[PDB]
Amino acid sequence: PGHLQEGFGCVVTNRFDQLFDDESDPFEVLKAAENK
């Protein structure tokens, strides 16, 4: 599972996967979402 399962023979899962490469402010990403 996730974007790392390629490089691991065993099963790897992470609950916070979707937060990867997201350093932006959650309130402003929300504002963008309800804008669109």
Partner 1 sequence: GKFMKPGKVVLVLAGRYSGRKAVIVKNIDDGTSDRPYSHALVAGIDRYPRKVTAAMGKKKIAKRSKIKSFVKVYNYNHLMPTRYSVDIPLDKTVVNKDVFRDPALKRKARREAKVKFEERYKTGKNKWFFQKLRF
Partner 2 sequence: KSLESINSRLQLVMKSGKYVLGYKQTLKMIRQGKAKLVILANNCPALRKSEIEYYAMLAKTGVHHYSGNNIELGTACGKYYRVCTLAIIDPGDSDIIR
Partner 3 sequence: VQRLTYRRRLSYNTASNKTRLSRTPGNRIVYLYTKKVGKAPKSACGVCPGRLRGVRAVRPKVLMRLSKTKKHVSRAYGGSMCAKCVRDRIKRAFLIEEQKIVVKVLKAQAQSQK
Q: Which residues bind partner 2 (CB under 8 A)?
A: 2, 4-17, 19-20
CB 5 within 8 A of CB 14: no
Minimum distance, C-beta of residue 36 to partner 3, in the bound complex (Å)? 11
Number of residues that bind partner 3 (CB under 8 A): 6
Nearer to partner 1 by Cβ, of 13 and 27: the residue is: 27
The span from the CA of 8 to the CA of 15, in Å, is 17
In the complex, which residues of this chain contact partner 1 (CB under 8 A)?
Answer: 19, 22-28
